[PDB]
């Protein structure tokens, strides 16, 4: 109660003491409070076939020992993004969805692993078949962009020399659209002359 009592209330306090039940609010003191208070509903664990898609790929890259705690390490390495909705338990949801549907059986030697792939190594061949050569195709369609993204500069390599020759187009007038109210008549004419002293000889 010192944190509450001490006059100048700190910042941690203001976030800790909040147990409100509005959207995007303190979840701890929404969890901490009564079961009649929490609307902290069940963690949406994804057991998608997508969660199978980042499963049958990895094991055929490394099917050795102890693949139940450092299997998530692969998920913390092989990262376009992980796989486990909750690294904690979804990676422990990975074997049970693999153990069921007849996909993966464990391997036990000094410790428990995920090796041997349970006689489905044929469907792992034609999974990686739908990997690199699927990643190969889409990265060149943006190279079609990047075969003209070179041109993106080149189509405005002239225009940035053009529309910065347009950036004077108005100023040249406005350089003298304000000279009007200062009246040089010598620095005024020459500033229009020295521009047109070489403008007509160009082309």
């Amino acid at each position: 109660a010192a944190a509450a009592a001490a006059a100048a209330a700190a910042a941690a306090a203001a976030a800790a003491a909040a147990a409100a039940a509005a959207a995007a609010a303190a979840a701890a003191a929404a969890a901490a409070a009564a079961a009649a208070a929490a609307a902290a509903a069940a963690a949406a664990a994804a057991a998608a076939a997508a969660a199978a898609a980042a499963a049958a790929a990895a094991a055929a890259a490394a099917a050795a020992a102890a693949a139940a705690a450092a299997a998530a390490a692969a998920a913390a390495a092989a990262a376009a993004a992980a796989a486990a909705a909750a690294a904690a338990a979804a990676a422990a949801a990975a074997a049970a969805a693999a153990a069921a549907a007849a996909a993966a059986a464990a391997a036990a030697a000094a410790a428990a692993a995920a090796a041997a792939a349970a006689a489905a190594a044929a469907a792992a061949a034609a999974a990686a078949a739908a990997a690199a050569a699927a990643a190969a195709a889409a990265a060149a369609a943006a190279a079609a962009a990047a075969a003209a993204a070179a041109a993106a500069a080149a189509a405005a390599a002239a225009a940035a020399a053009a529309a910065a020759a347009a950036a004077a187009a108005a100023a040249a007038a406005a350089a003298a659209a304000a000279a009007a109210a200062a009246a040089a008549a010598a620095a005024a004419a020459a500033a229009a002359a020295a521009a047109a002293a070489a403008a007509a000889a160009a082309a």
Binding site: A7, A8, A10, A11, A12, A14, A18, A24, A26
Partner: protein
């Protein structure tokens, strides 16, 4: 500290202003909106702590990771200016 979709900002913890701590609407740094910023990072105390020096609040860890990343690159803009005027 307070971050939504557009931009960012720095606030503080005026003890009267608590019901704004978690979600204070604010004019976003980007073009225009009265965006409903949320609470991301603690950034230390307003008033001092009784018989505790000014460093006892502590901003945050990630807030150090913020100005060292948001501002951060004083070596990338020592152009036209340094800490002086």
């Amino acid at each position: 500290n307070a971050c939504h979709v557009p931009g960012d900002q720095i606030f503080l913890v005026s003890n009267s202003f608590t019901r704004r701590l978690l979600t204070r609407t604010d004019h976003c740094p980007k073009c225009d909106r009265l965006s409903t910023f949320r609470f991301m990072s603690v950034s230390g105390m307003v008033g001092r702590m009784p018989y505790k020096p000014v460093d006892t609040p502590g901003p945050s860890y990630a807030t150090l990771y913020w100005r060292k990343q948001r501002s951060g690159k004083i070596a990338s803009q020592p152009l036209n200016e340094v800490c002086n005027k």
